[PDB]
Write a protein that binds this ligand. Structure first.
Ligand SMILES: CCCCCCCCCCCCCCCCCC(=O)OC[C@H](COP(=O)([O-])OCC(O)COP(=O)([O-])OC[C@@H](COC(=O)CCCCCCCCCCCCCCCCC)OC(=O)CCCCCCCCCCCCCCCCC)OC(=O)CCCCCCCCCCCCCCCCC
Ligand code: BCL
Ligand code: BCL
Ligand code: BCL
Ligand SMILES: CC[C@H]1c2cc3[nH]c4c(c3C)C(=O)[C@H](C(=O)OC)c4c3nc(cc4[nH]c(cc(n2)[C@@H]1C)c(C(C)=O)c4C)[C@@H](C)[C@@H]3CCC(=O)OC/C=C(\C)CCC[C@H](C)CCC[C@H](C)CCCC(C)C
Ligand SMILES: CC[C@H]1c2cc3[nH]c4c(c3C)C(=O)[C@H](C(=O)OC)c4c3nc(cc4[nH]c(cc(n2)[C@@H]1C)c(C(C)=O)c4C)[C@@H](C)[C@@H]3CCC(=O)OC/C=C(\C)CCC[C@H](C)CCC[C@H](C)CCCC(C)C
Ligand SMILES: COC1=C(OC)C(=O)C(C/C=C(\C)CC/C=C(\C)CC/C=C(\C)CC/C=C(\C)CC/C=C(\C)CC/C=C(\C)CC/C=C(\C)CC/C=C(\C)CC/C=C(\C)CCC=C(C)C)=C(C)C1=O
Ligand SMILES: COC(C)(C)C/C=C/C(C)=C/C=C/C(C)=C/C=C/C(C)=C/C=C\C=C(C)\C=C\C=C(/C)CC/C=C(\C)CCC=C(C)C
Ligand SMILES: COC1=C(OC)C(=O)C(C/C=C(\C)CCC=C(C)C)=C(C)C1=O
Ligand SMILES: CCCCCCCCCCCC[N+](C)(C)[O-]
Ligand SMILES: CCCCCCCCCCCC[N+](C)(C)[O-]
Ligand SMILES: CCCCCCCCCCCC[N+](C)(C)[O-]
Ligand SMILES: CCCCCCCCCCCC[N+](C)(C)[O-]
Ligand SMILES: CCCCCCCCCCCC[N+](C)(C)[O-]
Ligand SMILES: [Fe+3]
Lengths: 240, 281, 302
């Protein structure tokens, strides 16, 4: 019967499709590892797929995956138990060391570029002719931390030019230097910007950027990870 | 047992209950208090389903069916073999789903991410609870809930629907279906868009989000953008489930007649009710 | 309250974005529409530009002709009365020829001929719009994933209105043009084929429809949860994995014991979706051509 043939065939097709899809999703993070970095004995029933290569725009190279995996950074953690499957305690300050929820990845230390090869993200002051078009303008507002102290003041918005969206607030600190705060981690209010993730004293420790008019993917990861990490690591100095 | 980038994230903390007591993994799986609760609820639930299969006298997965108490029991307990097992399996299931969501919250806290995932899942739980708890309570009997069986749950959907004529005429059902269809359409388009940019024509460089905006604007004159589309898909699919639960909470309670006749209010409006011609005059 | 990224707190605007050139014939692009502050709370404020082109003009014109052919019939059914039109809007129906005309085009205007005309305009509107999804990707150097996904929807459409009718031997099998009447057609199709709940392809179609909502709920929620690390910049995370993509993956690994990549999730996405109308179209195509009664079929297991 043609319908039973069709249904039987579909189940075979679907097994192959799931196989294809699962292997496609193993182009990163594999092979699996033991807690010390070495290849784990058990890799599971799915083999790695044949490598594929992406051509990156603006002469930035290619990416081939799967490929050799490495963290390319020290991980200030250590075991807390004698067997597999337990947590790894920070060896220093987990905010400073970039571990746990404060983690960052070693992405390329260049800025993301738009389709024309210009920097994707710019301070609004350098983006012609971008301006706040709706909602409360954060520029000028005092910035408050989860300890209810003023950490600084907003001096600009970092905007995504091609996508016309606000990505960071540039906040100036007591010493005249600035930090980027992720837009998704601030609450803009009528009389302040509030930052639940960080107490006021942790603002100086936000990873700085090396050029004051651009930000690299690497710098972005360090800033975002640092701010998110405060949720767990600033919890003691917070605060109903 | 660990992805190549995983170890830096496996720190202590984030748990809701128990401190470090259950703060550990089993292979890839995080555990936590709610991993223990999930296991307890799920295991008891499956044991009880298997017990129900023994009392029904079959092991065929296409035949096993656990029915709620008959209508005559109302909202009280029933003998195990006559709807009581269903009652306990339902407590177990709810236990398991809520445990699962709460374990998800623990995982969010460890990972320093937003709570969006367990929030979205709660909608699914609410829809389940609408069918097995809220609606049956409002209607006065457990027996209006669906049975736990692969084919029998489908008999229930059919019998329940036809109790009101063609269920297509439920207006909240109509909105719900529209969100479902629109969600699937958006899923197809999101998936296709990202892939069409990451995997361009042979030999060409990866396209940018700018190309993605350009393509959709070229096509339909608008682009929701990259944050927009993930907001969209979340909204569409949660709205589908909200209106799914709505469409049923109102059926057998505030409306209990044939849904087709609900639409008469529009036709019977004074200013055109009596004009001849058309389909209704 | 932690801010949730459902609606933007602050909108910013710059010069109207005219988009990427690549191989696009720029003569065929409109200018920018207005900017909707309303839309801009949720997505992009900018409207337009759009791309015209001959195919686009054909498609759109043809699509309106389809729409107007149905509206004309609706007005006629209302006896030209505006008040009856609005009152009975969902009750009107442009219906296919009777079985007796078979597949012929010899049916009278009022008894099927107008249905065929409307159908004709829909046919060219849809297919020319498909060619459009291909060509807009081509001119931009992009993959053809959109046109390929669109073909899955077209498949169900074609099966319902064209392929299944031709195979059954008459246009009377096709779907009527009407709000309520398309629903009645749907209910009646199931009834006449012994209950679609016994069609394993209808059941797969549902698994994927539900599946699409599960997955987009999952994916959408995930991206939003990691948007504090730039998660929605999916293409640069594919090209250069960040902590967004790693926390995303690990959420799911810790929860359900496996996970995706930033590129691979979008492959799960496209397939979960296209399989709705793919299995769907097969379930319908087989109905009446090969299987008269799905309950009966299911008793023989096949
Ligand atoms: C009756 C049914 C009616 C059918 C109607 C409609 C069907 C709709 C099809 C849906 C297509 C959407 C999928 C998107 C996709 O990934 O493909 C992109 C890809 C196009 O890429 P592109 O966007 O142009 O370029 C970008 C990149 O260069 C390349 O892009 P990329 O890297 O993203 O894609 C590369 C692609 C390479 O392209 C393909 O060939 C894709 C195709 C597909 C396959 C099989 C389809 C089966 C349909 C289901 C049948 C069910 C049975 C009942 O690799 C795959 O996706 C592959 C496959 C996984 C399927 C594996 C299978 C199961 C088999 C079996 C069982 C065996 C053992 C198990 C035990 O699709 C195709 O090339 C196929 C089109 C062929 C048309 C030929 C026309 C000749 C004139
Ligand atoms: C003949 C039958 C009637 C009909 C009968 C009714 C009835 C009755 C109902 C619907 C409802 C549905 N119908 Mg109807 N309706 C029919 C015609 C249709 C048509 C159509 C094209 O003809 C469509 C598209 C729909 C679509 C709709 C949806 C809006 C809705 C189901 C989605 C849902 O509730 O999700 C919600 C999601 C859930 C309930 C799942 C949640 C589960 C989670 C929490 C837990 C599961 C995890 C665990 C068990 C997994 C196992 C563990 C393993 C490790 C995996 N109907 C016909 C006319 N319809 C239903 C509804 O709205 O209910 C609310 C409903 O009760
Ligand atoms: C949602 C509205 C209606 C509904 C109407 C329909 C209709 C109509 C159909 C189904 C069908 C499905 N329904 Mg139902 N059914 C509902 C209630 C549910 C609930 C629940 C609330 O707990 C569950 C677990 C199921 C699960 C089932 C699956 C057996 C099947 C595929 C679903 C799917 O791919 O989803 C999408 C989600 C995924 C893709 C994730 C995969 C998880 C699935 C496979 C879970 C399977 C669990 C099942 C075997 C329960 C065993 C639990 C164990 C004892 C632990 N239904 C309510 C009553 N359901 C289809 C079928 O063919 O059934 C025969 C079908 O045509
Ligand atoms: C009483 C009704 C019957 C039944 C009748 C049928 C029938 C008949 C069918 C389905 C089909 C489906 N049913 Mg059913 N259905 C029932 C029970 C249900 C229930 C439930 C009880 O909970 C559910 C969840 C489902 C849900 C489903 C879907 C999985 C599926 C349609 C997928 C889709 O995306 O189509 C929507 C997608 C399309 C229609 C394709 C769109 C094509 C493009 C080209 C459209 C062009 C648009 C353009 C011209 C218009 C422009 C206007 C704009 C403003 C621009 N059914 C009961 C048993 N069901 C379909 C199927 O495939 O089944 C196998 C189908 O034919
Ligand atoms: C709200 C929008 C959509 C949605 C959202 C959603 N679902 C989700 C998630 C979210 C965001 C979760 O993060 C969670 C997940 O981990 O995903 C993999 C989940 C999930 N959705 C799932 C299933 C599911 N969701 C459904 C659909 C939907 N989910 C909506 C369409 C459906 C449908 C449409 O029927 C199904 C079947 C699971 C894969 C997963 C939750 C897994 C879980 O809670 O595990 C804990 C419990 C067990 C391992 C099993 C317990 C066994 C019971 C004690 C006994 C069984 C009783 C049962 C009632 C019998 C059913 C018999 C059937 C034949 C009817
Ligand atoms: C799993 C498959 C799912 C799916 C996917 C899908 N659909 C597709 C495609 C894909 C990937 C697209 O590429 C394509 C698209 O371009 O989307 C943006 C599309 C599409 N699916 C659409 C709708 C649609 N899809 C369906 C759903 C689904 N599609 C499935 C759920 C359904 C349902 C659920 O019934 C609907 C109705 C369209 C938005 C679009 C196809 C566009 C098209 O074929 O147009 C042809 C006709 C016209 C150009 C005009 C139509 C007539 C209008 C009534 C006129 C009124 C408006 C007019 C445009 C005003 C402007 C005039 C002025 C100049 C005066
Ligand atoms: C970009 O980002 C994203 C990713 O990452 C980069 C992702 O990964 C994902 C995740 C998405 C995928 C991996 C795609 C494929 C997933 C689907 C099609 C969704 C359907 C899911 C399933 C069918 C699997 C369901 C299986 C479950 C729920 C787990 C089963 C495990 C058990 C046996 C349960 C028993 C109890 C446990 C494990 C509790 C733990 C306690 C003890 C062991 C004690 C998304 C959404 C994402 O957007
Ligand atoms: C205000 O009034 C005005 C005048 C402006 C008009 C207003 C418009 C109104 C009120 C009309 C509303 C339109 C409606 C209600 C349409 C809805 C129809 C629905 C719900 C469609 C659903 C199903 C459609 C399907 C499946 C159609 C499939 C069609 C095909 C696959 C094409 C088949 C091709 C055929 C038969 C022609 C063969 C031709 C060749 C190639 C030889
Ligand atoms: C990351 O890319 C994404 C966007 O950003 C560039 C989008 O703009 C869109 C397109 C958004 C629309 C208009 C959804 C279509 C659904 C309806 C309601 C017709 C998609 C698909 C996408 O993936
Ligand atoms: C329909 C969805 C089915 C998906 C379930 C199977 C995939 C999970 C197995 C992947 C193996 C995980 N591993 C060992 C590679 O890490
Ligand atoms: C309450 C539902 C009964 C649970 C049955 C256990 C799920 C097994 C999945 C069905 C597989 C059917 N099969 C292929 C073995 O025949
Ligand atoms: C499916 C979404 C539909 C989007 C609507 C299309 C808006 C395009 C407006 C472009 C026209 C600009 N204008 C008026 C200056 O010519
Ligand atoms: C993208 C692939 C995900 C796979 C989803 C698998 C769902 C299986 C549901 C079983 C359907 C049973 N039935 C009756 C339709 O044959
Ligand atoms: C259809 C749902 C069936 C559940 C299957 C879920 C697949 C998860 C596989 C995880 C196994 C992990 N590991 C490392 C032990 O292989
Ligand atoms: Fe995405």
């Amino acid at each position: 019967d043609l319908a039973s043939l069709a249904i039987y065939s579909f189940w075979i097709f679907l097994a192959g499709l799931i196989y294809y899809l699962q292997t496609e999703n193993m182009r990163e993070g594999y092979p699996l590892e033991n807690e010390d970095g070495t290849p784990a004995a058990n890799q599971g029933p799915f083999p790695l797929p044949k490598p594929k290569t992406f051509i990156l725009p603006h002469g930035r190279g290619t990416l081939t995956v799967p490929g050799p995996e490495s963290e390319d950074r020290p991980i200030a953690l250590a075991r807390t138990a004698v067997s597999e499957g337990f947590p790894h305690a920070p060896t220093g300050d987990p905010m400073k060391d970039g571990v746990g929820p404060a983690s960052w990845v070693a992405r390329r230390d260049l800025p993301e570029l738009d389709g024309h090869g210009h920097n994707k993200i710019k301070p609004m002051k350098a983006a012609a002719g971008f301006h706040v078009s709706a909602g409360k303008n954060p520029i000028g507002l005092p910035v408050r931390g989860c300890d209810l102290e003023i950490a600084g003041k907003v001096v600009d918005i970092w905007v995504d030019i091609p996508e016309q969206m606000a990505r960071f607030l540039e906040v100036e600190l007591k010493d005249g230097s600035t930090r980027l705060l992720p837009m998704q981690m601030v609450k803009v209010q009528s009389n302040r910007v509030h930052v639940n993730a960080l107490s006021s004293d942790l603002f100086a420790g936000i990873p700085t950027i090396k050029s004051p008019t651009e930000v690299t993917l690497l710098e972005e990861d360090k800033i975002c990870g640092y701010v998110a990490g405060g949720l767990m690591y600033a919890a003691p100095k917070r605060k109903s | 047992a660990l992805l190549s980038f995983e170890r830096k994230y496996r720190v202590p903390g984030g748990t809701l209950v128990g401190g470090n007591l259950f703060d550990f993994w089993v292979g890839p799986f995080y555990v936590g208090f709610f991993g223990v609760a999930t296991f307890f609820f799920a295991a008891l639930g499956i044991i009880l389903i298997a017990w129900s299969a023994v009392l029904q006298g079959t092991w065929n997965p296409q035949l096993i069916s656990v029915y709620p108490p008959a209508l005559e029991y109302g909202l009280g307990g029933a003998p195990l073999a006559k709807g009581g097992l269903w009652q306990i399996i339902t407590i177990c299931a709810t236990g398991a789903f809520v445990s699962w969501a709460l374990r998800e919250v623990e995982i969010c806290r460890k990972l320093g991410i937003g709570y969006h995932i367990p929030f979205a899942f709660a909608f699914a739980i609410l829809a389940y609870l609408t069918l097995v708890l809220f609606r049956p309570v409002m209607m006065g009997a457990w027996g209006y809930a669906f049975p736990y069986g692969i084919w029998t749950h489908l008999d229930w959907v059919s019998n329940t629907g036809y109790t009101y004529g063609n269920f297509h005429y439920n207006p909240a059902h109509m909105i719900a279906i529209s969100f479902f269809f629109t969600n699937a359409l958006a899923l197809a388009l999101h998936g296709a868009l990202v892939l069409s940019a990451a995997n361009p024509e042979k030999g060409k460089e990866m396209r940018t989000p700018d190309h993605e905006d350009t393509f959709f604007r070229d096509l339909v004159g608008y682009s929701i953008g990259t944050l927009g589309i993930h907001r969209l898909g979340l909204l569409l699919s949660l709205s589908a489930v909200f209106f799914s639960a709505l469409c049923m909470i109102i059926t057998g309670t505030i409306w209990f007649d044939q849904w087709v006749d609900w639409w008469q209010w529009w036709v019977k409006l004074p200013w055109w009710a009596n004009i001849p011609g058309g389909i209704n005059g | 309250a932690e801010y949730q990224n459902i609606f933007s707190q602050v909108q910013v605007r710059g010069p109207a974005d005219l988009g990427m050139t690549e191989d696009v014939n720029l003569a065929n692009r409109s200018g920018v529409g207005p900017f909707s502050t309303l839309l801009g709370w949720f997505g992009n404020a900018q409207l337009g530009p759009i791309y015209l082109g001959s195919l686009g003009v054909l498609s759109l014109f043809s699509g309106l002709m389809w729409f107007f052919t149905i509206g004309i019939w609706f007005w006629y059914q209302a006896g030209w009365n505006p008040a009856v039109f609005l009152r009975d809007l969902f009750f009107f129906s442009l219906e296919p020829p009777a079985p007796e005309y078979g597949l012929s085009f010899a049916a009278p205007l009022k008894e099927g001929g107008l249905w065929l005309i409307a159908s004709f305009f829909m046919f060219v509107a849809v297919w020319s719009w498909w060619g459009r999804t291909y060509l807009r990707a081509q001119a931009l150097g992009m993959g053809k994933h959109t046109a390929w996904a669109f073909l899955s929807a077209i498949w169900l459409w074609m099966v319902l209105g064209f392929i299944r009718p031709i195979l059954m031997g008459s246009w009377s099998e096709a779907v009527p043009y009407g709000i309520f009447s398309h629903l009645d057609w749907t209910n009646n199709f199931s009834l006449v084929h012994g209950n679609l709940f016994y069609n394993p392809f209808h059941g797969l179609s549902i698994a994927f429809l539900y599946g699409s909502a599960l997955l987009f709920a999952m994916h959408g929620a995930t991206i939003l949860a990691v948007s504090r690390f730039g998660g929605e910049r999916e293409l640069e995370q594919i090209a250069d994995r960040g902590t967004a993509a790693e926390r995303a993956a690990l959420f799911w690994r810790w929860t359900m014991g496996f996970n995706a990549t930033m590129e691979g999730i979008h492959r799960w996405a496209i397939w979960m979706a296209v399989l709705v109308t793919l299995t769907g179209g097969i379930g319908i195509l087989l109905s009446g051509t090969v299987v008269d009664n799905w309950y009966v079929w299911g008793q023989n297991h096949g």
